[PDB]
Amino acid sequence: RTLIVTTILEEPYVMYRKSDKPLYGNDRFEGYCLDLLKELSNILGFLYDVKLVPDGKYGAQNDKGEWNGMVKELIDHRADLAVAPLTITYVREKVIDFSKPFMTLGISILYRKGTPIDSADDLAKQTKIEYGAVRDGSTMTFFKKSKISTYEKMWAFMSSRQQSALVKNSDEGIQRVLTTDYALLMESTSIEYVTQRNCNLTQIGGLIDSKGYGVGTPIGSPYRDKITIAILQLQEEGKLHMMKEKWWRGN
Amino acid sequence: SNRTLIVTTILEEPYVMYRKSDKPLYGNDRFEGYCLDLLKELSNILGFLYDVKLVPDGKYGAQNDKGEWNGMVKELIDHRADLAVAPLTITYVREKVIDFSKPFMTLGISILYRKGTPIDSADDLAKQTKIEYGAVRDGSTMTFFKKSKISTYEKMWAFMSSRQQSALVKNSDEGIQRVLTTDYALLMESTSIEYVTQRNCNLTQIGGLIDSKGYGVGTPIGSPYRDKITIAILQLQEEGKLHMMKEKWWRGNGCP
Ligand SMILES: O=C(O)[C@@H]1C[C@H]2C[C@@H](CN3CC(F)(F)C[C@H]3C(=O)O)CC[C@H]2CN1
Ligand SMILES: O=C(O)[C@@H]1C[C@H]2C[C@@H](CN3CC(F)(F)C[C@H]3C(=O)O)CC[C@H]2CN1
Ligand SMILES: [N+]
């Protein structure tokens, strides 16, 4: 066959390949997820056709409870697999299958090096260093929904003053950390990408939660089990580690 | 008459433990722990009766030099159990011979060490020799380091295996004692570290997770129970029951 793979542009998982002339088909894209897709293809033996998700969304439910994004593409059988940094959540797991995670991670703190701040507790107990998250992002939502005291206090601070401590998107957030006295709460995968490329920034403290990214399949897929096993094989052989360093290691 | 599933499991604190008693107990009443509570919760979602049987050889399941399997894995292969409800790590080699549900716990390897020091990562340990570090001999964490191709873990394994493997320890209890009495860091599964740090207020988990992995319910290959178990684990997640059960069995005396 040719499997249709839904995916989404997200640096450095899936990016348009630099070119001086128009590119076509799978040659338009490169990145960690394209390399993962290639390894999966080699192990399981399938051909594939990468299609960016038309609405540019990962997948969530609206007020009606209808799904969108890559999740919807799988539900509607317009895609055979989603190979993207798609977070495994029980709400999605109800409607699609997920492989074993190919990346495990958690929320953490991006800030400057050389300071006395060593945890979320240290941020929460003060107000001089501003801190926040990308508005309407996965991490902001974690804080908004937390029932843990420290994280409730943090959300109160973040959501205070008309949410001035929140940012529009990740690049704005990263530049806010660089230019001002500000700490950004974000997924640790994104933090490591930034700290690899900005020597004066660091992850502060450990991970505040745990989550993982998995390959999405429609429920009933003949590829479900085989994908999990292939990811286990790639982890054991050190290949996931190699592909991560390929795309994350920076200047 | 009725279908009672046979469930293989293994004594391992606080997953499966003999219940305290002033008289002999029999049957399922002999046992308590996180996995007994998980099994009860699953049985009330899927609808089944069950009979817990400790794996006779006391092993999780590995292959000998001839490729033959033992432990809970072999009980499943031979259809002497319907389910293995235990902290059975989902691994590549086991996936070739049994099936697993989605994980009911996710975890990794981490570092058990004293509080109040500047050590923050495996890389901090690997780049020095003053603080000794190691793992339980022949355990899953030691096996990870011994097989690792990753640079810093290769360096750590060379330290651990140097000097007649003096940096390794015999079992978890000696490992924990060695961290408490000497300048020693123990590499251990994170679920075991969490159990220890709840009970020893001067110890901490250092750094994040290595070798991410999950524990799943094992079934024989092809079993129709496997997907039903997955569906049930999702429901227990949505109900907050997995978190509740973790708190119940991991909580200690508190630390001031
Ligand atoms: O499946 C999902 O919803 C997410 C979306 C996407 C989320 C980003 C991280 N967020 C993007 C963001 F810019 F919104 C801020 C950041 C965060 O909330 O931590 C990392 C890569 C993806 C991981 N899976
Ligand atoms: O499936 C398996 O082989 C393992 C066995 C068993 C392994 C223990 C962890 N080990 C016990 C130990 F504490 F002695 C050392 C530790 C480790 O390897 O890091 C945790 C509970 C189980 C998780 N699944
Ligand atoms: N399997």
A220 touches chain B (CB under 8 A): no
Q: Which residues of A touch B208 (CB under 8 A)?
A: 106, 188, 206-207
Resolution in A, one decimal?
1.6
Q: Which fold has domain B1-107+213-256?
A: D-Maltodextrin-Binding Protein; domain 2 (3.40.190)
Atom of ligand 1 nearest to the CA of A139: 18
User: Are B234 and A210 a contacting pair at CB < 8 A?
Assistant: no
Which of helix, strand or coil describes residue B254?
A: coil
Nearest to A218 by CA among A18, A12, A41, A67: A67
Distance CA A85, CA A14 (A): 9
The b/e string for B134-170 (b: 16+ C-beta within 10 A; e otherwise) is bbbeebbbbebbeebebeebebbbebbbeeeeebbbe
What six digits make up the tokens of A80? 């055979």
What six digits make up the tokens of A78? 């317009």
Range(s) within chain B of domains with CATH label 3.40.190.10: 1-107+213-256, 108-212
B139 ligand 2 Cβ < 6 A: yes
Q: Which fold has domain A1-105+211-251?
A: D-Maltodextrin-Binding Protein; domain 2 (3.40.190)
Q: Of the candidates A90, A100, A207, which has its C-beta nearest B208's C-beta? A: A207
Range(s) within chain A of domains with CATH label 3.40.190.10: 1-105+211-251, 106-210
DSSP code of residue B69: B
User: Are B90 and A232 a contacting pair at CB < 8 A?
Assistant: yes
Q: Which fold has domain B108-212?
A: D-Maltodextrin-Binding Protein; domain 2 (3.40.190)
Tell me, in angstroms, the distance from the centre of ligand 2 to residue B253's CA: 24
User: Are A206 and B207 a contacting pair at CB < 8 A?
Assistant: yes
User: Are B92 and A212 a contacting pair at CB < 8 A?
Assistant: no
Do the strands A15-16 and A211-218 form a parallel or antiparallel pair, or are they unpaired? unpaired
- Asked if residues A92 and A102 have their Cβ atoms less than 8 Å apart, the reply is no
A180 marked ligand binding residue: no
B30, B115, B207 from B202: Cα distances, Å: 34, 6, 16
> Residue with the nearest Cα to atom 13 of ligand 1?
A170
Distance CA B209, CA A105 (A): 9
Q: Which residues of A touch B150 (CB under 8 A)?
A: 238, 241
Class of domain A106-210: alpha beta
Distance CA A90, CA A67 (A): 14
Instruction: Say how far residue B93 (Cα) sits from the centre of its chain.
Output: 17
Q: If you count residue pairs, one on A and one on B, with CB atoms under 8 Å apart, how many are there?
A: 42
Closest-CA distance of chain B to residue A126, Å: 22
Nearest to B245 by CA among B2, B11, B15: B15
- Asked if residues A104 and B108 have their Cβ atoms less than 8 Å apart, the reply is yes
